[PDB]
Write an enzyme that holds these catalytic residues in place. Sequence first.
Site, PDB file in Angstrom:
ATOM      1  CG  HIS A   4      31.088 -24.833  28.456  1.00  0.00           C
ATOM      2  ND1 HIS A   4      31.799 -24.930  29.638  1.00  0.00           N
ATOM      3  CD2 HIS A   4      31.716 -25.646  27.577  1.00  0.00           C
ATOM      4  CE1 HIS A   4      32.820 -25.757  29.476  1.00  0.00           C
ATOM      5  NE2 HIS A   4      32.791 -26.209  28.233  1.00  0.00           N
ATOM      6  CG  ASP A   7      30.773 -23.085  32.255  1.00  0.00           C
ATOM      7  OD1 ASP A   7      29.680 -23.419  31.735  1.00  0.00           O
ATOM      8  OD2 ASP A   7      31.867 -23.554  31.836  1.00  0.00           O
ATOM      9  CB  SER A  25      33.873 -29.017  29.906  1.00  0.00           C
ATOM     10  OG  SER A  25      35.034 -28.764  29.113  1.00  0.00           O
ATOM     11  N   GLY A  26      32.506 -29.755  32.788  1.00  0.00           N
ATOM     12  CA  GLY A  26      31.288 -30.155  33.495  1.00  0.00           C
ATOM     13  C   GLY A  26      31.534 -31.218  34.581  1.00  0.00           C
TER      14      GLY A  26
HETATM   15  N1  LIG Z   1      42.244 -26.409  29.680  1.00  0.00           N
HETATM   16  C1  LIG Z   1      40.966 -26.805  29.805  1.00  0.00           C
HETATM   17  N2  LIG Z   1      40.582 -27.233  31.055  1.00  0.00           N
HETATM   18  C2  LIG Z   1      39.291 -27.657  31.273  1.00  0.00           C
HETATM   19  C3  LIG Z   1      38.302 -27.683  30.271  1.00  0.00           C
HETATM   20  C4  LIG Z   1      38.672 -27.246  28.967  1.00  0.00           C
HETATM   21  C5  LIG Z   1      37.699 -27.249  27.913  1.00  0.00           C
HETATM   22  C6  LIG Z   1      38.046 -26.812  26.609  1.00  0.00           C
HETATM   23  C7  LIG Z   1      39.370 -26.360  26.314  1.00  0.00           C
HETATM   24  C8  LIG Z   1      39.778 -25.859  24.956  1.00  0.00           C
HETATM   25  N3  LIG Z   1      39.688 -24.392  24.874  1.00  0.00           N
HETATM   26  C9  LIG Z   1      38.396 -23.699  24.943  1.00  0.00           C
HETATM   27  C10 LIG Z   1      38.724 -22.317  24.413  1.00  0.00           C
HETATM   28  C11 LIG Z   1      40.215 -22.128  24.719  1.00  0.00           C
HETATM   29  N4  LIG Z   1      40.883 -21.350  23.701  1.00  0.00           N
HETATM   30  S1  LIG Z   1      41.449 -19.767  24.134  1.00  0.00           S
HETATM   31  O1  LIG Z   1      42.668 -20.020  24.856  1.00  0.00           O
HETATM   32  O2  LIG Z   1      41.485 -19.143  22.829  1.00  0.00           O
HETATM   33  C12 LIG Z   1      40.270 -19.011  25.183  1.00  0.00           C
HETATM   34  C13 LIG Z   1      39.477 -17.961  24.694  1.00  0.00           C
HETATM   35  C14 LIG Z   1      38.543 -17.453  25.699  1.00  0.00           C
HETATM   36  N5  LIG Z   1      37.611 -16.437  25.589  1.00  0.00           N
HETATM   37  C15 LIG Z   1      36.819 -16.103  26.648  1.00  0.00           C
HETATM   38  C16 LIG Z   1      36.934 -16.782  27.886  1.00  0.00           C
HETATM   39  C17 LIG Z   1      37.891 -17.826  27.999  1.00  0.00           C
HETATM   40  C18 LIG Z   1      38.704 -18.183  26.932  1.00  0.00           C
HETATM   41  S2  LIG Z   1      39.900 -19.375  26.821  1.00  0.00           S
HETATM   42  C19 LIG Z   1      40.739 -23.553  24.742  1.00  0.00           C
HETATM   43  O3  LIG Z   1      41.923 -23.858  24.660  1.00  0.00           O
HETATM   44  C20 LIG Z   1      40.411 -26.355  27.442  1.00  0.00           C
HETATM   45  C21 LIG Z   1      40.040 -26.794  28.728  1.00  0.00           C
END
Ligand SMILES: Nc1nccc2ccc(CN3CC[C@H](NS(=O)(=O)c4cc5ncccc5s4)C3=O)cc12
Lengths: 234, 51
Positions: free
Chosen positions: A42, A88, A185-186
């Site tokens: 991603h 991923d 991430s990654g």
């Molecule tokens: N914690 C973290 N740890 C490691 C890396 C991260 C990278 C980005 C974000 C930031 N992000 C990325 C999207 C996420 N928002 S969500 O809860 O609406 C989600 C919606 C959704 N739909 C399908 C599958 C999964 C999801 S999670 C968030 O908080 C949080 C992280």
Amino acid sequence: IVGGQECKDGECPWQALLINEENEGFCGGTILSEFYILTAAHCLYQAKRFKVRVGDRNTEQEEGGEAVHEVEVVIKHNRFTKETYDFDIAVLRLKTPITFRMNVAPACLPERDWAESTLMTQKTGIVSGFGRTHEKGRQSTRLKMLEVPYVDRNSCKLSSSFIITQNMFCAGYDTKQEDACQGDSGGPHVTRFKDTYFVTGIVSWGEGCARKGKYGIYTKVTAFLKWIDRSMKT
Amino acid sequence: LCSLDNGDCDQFCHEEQNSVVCSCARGYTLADNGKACIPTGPYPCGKQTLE
Ligand SMILES: Nc1nccc2ccc(CN3CC[C@H](NS(=O)(=O)c4cc5ncccc5s4)C3=O)cc12
Ligand SMILES: [Ca+2]
């Protein structure tokens, strides 16, 4: 990384940083060998063109041990889906070989069965990166690392609003304020065994960061070990 | 066997013929005792760097 500590000299040598055209870090990576970097598929949707930086611990100043490397081949998992965050994983072949030195060294790839029986059975693993230090904050300027407990697969599944596929696992804390976060991430999730660190996960996602009742979600490396081997053989 | 203290192996443990067989990641070679793993050069995988 929210909470945790700064990686001290020589402590996280397998950390790679993907940087964009403006030289800003946007994702992490793990050094697998002189030519290959492990990262999240991603992240590849995050930049038009990017390079990999190794040996960096403080983006505020060139220290001397850093090295930028251009990417020759991006090998993304064929089955990766932006919609569910499944599969991923991605492997990067570098144009020039990395020269190992202080703060620059690869993490070991374990064998699947032993990894699943003995590494993911350990109490904790270690995640690291230059990502946000608070859910809404800015990217960290210093490389940090955090010890994250392996989380029972069932409580992990119950805690999540989204499907925890078989290519994912959980780590982190229920309420304690520590977790990887955006920008990490990654990046590497490694598990220590007799002073040797093995790669066990790839920083993937989570709902916010360090949220109560939520955990950090990681790509399960042990499920792609054959895929990684193939990617590095080409 | 391998569930008892990783079979006394430094790294990888496999139970073959009911016996423990130890092995090592790339860049290491199995020691003469058949249990320890010996780094083959500088900067072996998985080791934090001291210099
Ligand atoms: N914690 C973290 N740890 C490691 C890396 C991260 C990278 C980005 C974000 C930031 N992000 C990325 C999207 C996420 N928002 S969500 O809860 O609406 C989600 C919606 C959704 N739909 C399908 C599958 C999964 C999801 S999670 C968030 O908080 C949080 C992280
Ligand atoms: Ca620097």
